[PDB]
Design a protein around this ligand. Structure first.
Ligand SMILES: *[C@@H]1O[C@H](CO)[C@@H](O[C@@H]2O[C@H](CO)[C@@H](O[C@@H]3O[C@H](CO)[C@@H](O)[C@H](O)[C@@H]3O)[C@H](O)[C@H]2NC(C)=O)[C@H](O)[C@H]1NC(C)=O
Ligand SMILES: *[C@@H]1O[C@H](CO)[C@@H](O[C@@H]2O[C@H](CO)[C@@H](O[C@@H]3O[C@H](CO)[C@@H](O)[C@H](O)[C@@H]3O)[C@H](O)[C@H]2NC(C)=O)[C@H](O)[C@H]1NC(C)=O
Ligand SMILES: *[C@@H]1O[C@H](CO)[C@@H](O[C@@H]2O[C@H](CO)[C@@H](O)[C@H](O)[C@H]2NC(C)=O)[C@H](O)[C@H]1NC(C)=O
Ligand SMILES: *[C@@H]1O[C@H](CO)[C@@H](O[C@@H]2O[C@H](CO)[C@@H](O)[C@H](O)[C@H]2NC(C)=O)[C@H](O)[C@H]1NC(C)=O
Ligand SMILES: *[C@@H]1O[C@H](CO)[C@@H](O[C@@H]2O[C@H](CO)[C@@H](O)[C@H](O)[C@H]2NC(C)=O)[C@H](O)[C@H]1NC(C)=O
Ligand SMILES: CCCCC/C=C\C/C=C\CCCCCCCC(=O)O
Ligand SMILES: *[C@@H]1O[C@H](CO)[C@@H](O)[C@H](O)[C@H]1NC(C)=O
Ligand SMILES: *[C@@H]1O[C@H](CO)[C@@H](O)[C@H](O)[C@H]1NC(C)=O
Ligand SMILES: *[C@@H]1O[C@H](CO)[C@@H](O)[C@H](O)[C@H]1NC(C)=O
Ligand SMILES: *[C@@H]1O[C@H](CO)[C@@H](O)[C@H](O)[C@H]1NC(C)=O
Ligand SMILES: *[C@@H]1O[C@H](CO)[C@@H](O)[C@H](O)[C@H]1NC(C)=O
Lengths: 49, 48, 49, 49, 234, 32
């Protein structure tokens, strides 16, 4: 996600993660979030489970 | 009319409005202010 | 990491490789598949580990 | 916020139409899939194109 | 050693659909007649596949050309290793290569006579050029003569590969062993022709494999005490 | 992009016999 320039919306890139631990606070500290909309989940549950 | 009215007010930038919304996991909801939903409540963001 | 060799036979909370819940643990004879790590019933409940 | 976190692309581009022969025969993207006009949109959209 | 004896398995671009399952190694201990010489103890051979999203004809009207990034699955080390890679195939313009008039089919081959562990890939590179490869992965297969099952499905999380050797070596149950980062929807697959250039003293018979399409169905699976499925109902 | 080795130095692809009638043989294996 950080090595190269991001693609366009019609050419979206996909990352799938399995059997790993990721530093969510470090990921979120690099972005100024302006709007979010979750479905059948909450961001606190994503950070807690 | 209603029995009691409680107002919590603070200086807050409008660029971080998504951090005050329910369910958020940012620094504001984790270490600064978590909104209590026990009573009928409303959150207002405004400018002076 | 905490062990279960003390908390057998009573209601405890578990977090087994990300799977969370509460239940009662007891040493049993092995059934199911070892590699899948989880044994379920027909109602999608964890009955073995 | 920081331009060193992710390299900046040239511009934001997106598709407005994607059809065969006539606009009545439009091809719509599916949920979580790529557009049929991906190869055409790879050429980019700018002032001239 | 003479010319390769193959069928027209190329230029046959079957629809991928929901994926397919492959029955490998049936009748791997019986005796059957040679195809080139219509008899010996049959042995198990592994399929080689070629999956992509777009297909077209070759430079002179011959069908079976995969455009853009193509998922290629190849057995290696004489049925010991399996290599999967995701590249864009550029046809070559040799005397008998696909971008040339004298072209009928492409084939991969292994010379039985310290294993090189790269002969199949070299035989593939003889026919195609490999450019902009995203990933290459390798897997070990212990060589035996048991009947096996292999399958492929695609999903929003990528391409899933299922093998019986993971959990049920002596049964037919199929278990996932890798997930590939192929997110463009696969629409076509072809079975790559394979030949063995063994001498008359080293010739053998190879078991047929069967490819069955996969469909969204409800099944009634009977789970045994040890967790294996030995009985099902469609 | 992962490196997948040198390009083939050969200038001639191999010669193949495409016979289909020899391979038309049936040992039916339906899904049971
Ligand atoms: C999958 O592969 C096909 C090749 O068969 C790609 O189509 C080719 O895409 C290139 C790049 O967009 C095209 O080149 C362009 O040609 C125009 C003239 O038409 C020229 O003005 C541009 O400067 C550029 O050179 C090429 O024509 C085109 N060929 C065909 C037959 O469509 C396709 O883009 C690939 N798919 C993806 C998703 O990349
Ligand atoms: C073709 O013949 C070979 C002869 O070696 C067959 O391989 C053998 O298959 C049997 C069962 O089909 C295997 O027995 C199993 O052994 C394990 C312990 O390793 C045991 O726990 C199981 O309950 C079962 O008895 C045997 O190991 C295996 N031998 C070798 C060397 O692979 C092969 O299955 C035959 N293929 C056919 C009939 O399609
Ligand atoms: C996840 O990333 C954060 C950074 O956002 C890490 O926090 C750093 O921790 C080290 C040592 O604990 C400090 O010296 C840094 O000052 C911290 N950075 C910030 C921005 O506070 C954190 O260690 C990482 N790992 C975990 C497990 O949270
Ligand atoms: C979608 O975006 C990716 C990345 O932005 C593009 O991948 C690049 O493609 C060019 C040439 O096609 C290569 O030179 C780069 O090395 C690639 N970068 C990465 C990170 O993969 C891709 O081409 C785009 N696809 C379309 C259809 O536009
Ligand atoms: C078999 O061939 C492959 C390429 O087709 C080799 O893989 C690459 O080899 C080059 C040359 O050493 C390396 O620079 C690359 O890093 C290799 N890519 C990989 C491993 O993904 C492979 O090494 C060859 N096998 C042997 C035993 O040499
Ligand atoms: C910045 C988003 C991308 C970060 C990297 C990608 C994925 C991380 C996955 C899950 C975390 C979801 C957090 C939801 C953010 C909205 C809440 C807020 O923070 O107000
Ligand atoms: C659990 O049971 C198994 C089999 O009965 C036995 O081998 C093992 O020692 C037991 N462990 C404990 C902690 O009781
Ligand atoms: C980011 O922007 C600053 C603003 O002046 C500039 O100095 C710096 O070179 C930029 N970095 C990159 C990588 O473009
Ligand atoms: C391959 O051969 C079979 C046998 O006749 C034939 O039915 C089929 O059409 C051939 N495939 C192509 C692409 O011609
Ligand atoms: C043959 O192909 C190569 C690379 O694919 C190219 O450099 C060369 O010009 C081609 N020759 C002809 C005669 O087309
Ligand atoms: C098995 O895999 C290992 C790497 O895990 C590799 O070094 C080896 O060549 C493979 N094959 C055999 C026969 O060990």
């Amino acid at each position: 996600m950080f090595s190269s320039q991001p693609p366009q919306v019609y050419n979206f890139s996909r990352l799938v993660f399995t059997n790993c631990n990721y530093n969510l606070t470090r990921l979120l500290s690099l972005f100024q979030v302006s709007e979010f909309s979750c479905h059948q989940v909450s961001p606190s549950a994503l950070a807690s489970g | 009319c209603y029995s009691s009215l409680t107002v919590d007010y603070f200086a807050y930038p409008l660029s971080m409005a998504s951090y005050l919304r329910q369910g958020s996991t940012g620094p504001i909801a984790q270490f600064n202010y978590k909104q209590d939903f026990t009573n009928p409540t409303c959150r207002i963001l405004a400018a002076v | 990491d905490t062990k279960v060799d003390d908390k057998l036979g009573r209601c405890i909370e578990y977090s087994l490789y990300g799977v969370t819940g509460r239940g009662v643990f007891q040493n049993c004879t092995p059934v199911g598949l070892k590699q899948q790590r989880f044994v379920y019933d027909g109602f999608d409940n964890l009955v073995g580990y | 916020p920081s331009n060193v976190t992710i390299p900046l692309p040239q511009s934001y581009m997106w598709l407005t139409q994607c059809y065969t022969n006539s606009p009545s025969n439009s091809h719509y993207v599916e949920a979580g899939s790529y557009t049929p006009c991906l190869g055409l949109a790879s050429r980019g959209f700018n002032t001239f194109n | 050693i003479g010319k390769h004896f193959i069928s027209n398995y190329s230029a046959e671009t079957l629809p991928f659909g929901n994926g397919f399952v492959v029955r490998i190694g049936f009748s791997a201990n019986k005796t059957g007649s040679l195809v080139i010489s219509p008899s010996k103890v049959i042995k198990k051979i592994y399929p080689a596949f070629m999956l992509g999203t777009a297909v077209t004809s070759f430079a002179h009207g011959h069908a079976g050309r995969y455009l853009n990034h193509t998922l290629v699955i190849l057995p290696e080390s004489c049925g010991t290793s399996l290599t999967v890679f995701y590249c864009i195939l550029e046809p070559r313009n040799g005397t008998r290569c696909p971008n040339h008039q004298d072209y009928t089919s492409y084939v991969i081959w292994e010379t039985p006579h310290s294993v090189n562990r790269n002969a199949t890939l070299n035989s593939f590179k003889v026919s195609f050029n490999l450019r902009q490869c995203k990933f290459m992965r390798t897997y070990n297969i212990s060589d035996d003569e048991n009947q096996e099952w292999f399958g492929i499905t695609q999903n929003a999380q990528g391409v899933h590969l299922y093998s019986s050797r993971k959990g049920d070596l002596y049964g037919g149950n199929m278990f996932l062993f890798d997930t590939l980062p192929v997110y463009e929807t696969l629409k076509y697959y072809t079975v790559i022709p394979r030949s063995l250039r063994s001498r008359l003293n080293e010739r053998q018979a190879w078991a047929a494999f069967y490819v069955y399409s996969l469909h969204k169905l409800t099944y009634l699976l009977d789970f045994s005490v040890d967790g294996y499925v030995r009985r099902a109902i469609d | 992009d992962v490196d997948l080795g040198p390009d083939s130095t050969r200038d001639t692809c191999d010669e193949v016999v495409v016979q289909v009638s020899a391979f038309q043989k049936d040992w039916p294996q339906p899904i049971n």
